[PDB]
C-alpha cells in the first residue's frame, strides 16, 4: 500500500505502509525519510488532525491517498 504525504514545501513524500499502520509509525517513517522529529509533526487528512494511536484504516485512508504534514515547535 502506497500513501502520499505533502510537505510545507509542496514536496510529496511516498511511503510504503499497511492499513494497520498507526499514525505514530507513519511519523517514524517520515523521520527516516526527512529527518523530522515526530513530536514536531502534525498529520492532516480530510482537514482533521490525526491521533498517533489510531490507524490509517481508522481515518479511511486508502491506496494512493494524500496526507498533509504541518510542522510545529514543542515548547512544553
Amino acid at each position: 500500500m502506497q500513501i502520499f504525504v505533502k510537505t510545507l514545501t509542496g514536496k510529496t513524500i511516498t511511503l510504503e505502509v499497511e492499513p494497520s499502520d498507526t499514525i505514530e509509525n507513519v511519523k517514524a517513517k517520515i523521520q527516516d525519510k526527512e529527518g523530522i522529529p515526530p513530536d514536531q509533526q502534525r498529520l492532516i487528512f480530510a482537514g482533521k488532525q490525526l491521533e498517533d494511536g489510531r490507524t490509517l484504516s481508522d481515518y479511511n485512508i486508502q491506496k494512493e491517498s494524500t496526507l498533509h504534514l504541518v510542522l510545529r515547535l514543542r515548547g512544553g
Partner: protein
Amino acid sequence: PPKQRCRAPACDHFGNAKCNGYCNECFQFKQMY
C-alpha cells in the same frame, strides 16, 4: 494589507510578506528542512 493564511498546506497561521507568504514558524522549519 489584507490578511492571508500561510502558504503551507493545512497550516492555519497567517503568512507574511517577509517570509514569502509563509508564517514565521513554517518559514523557520523551511530553513531547517
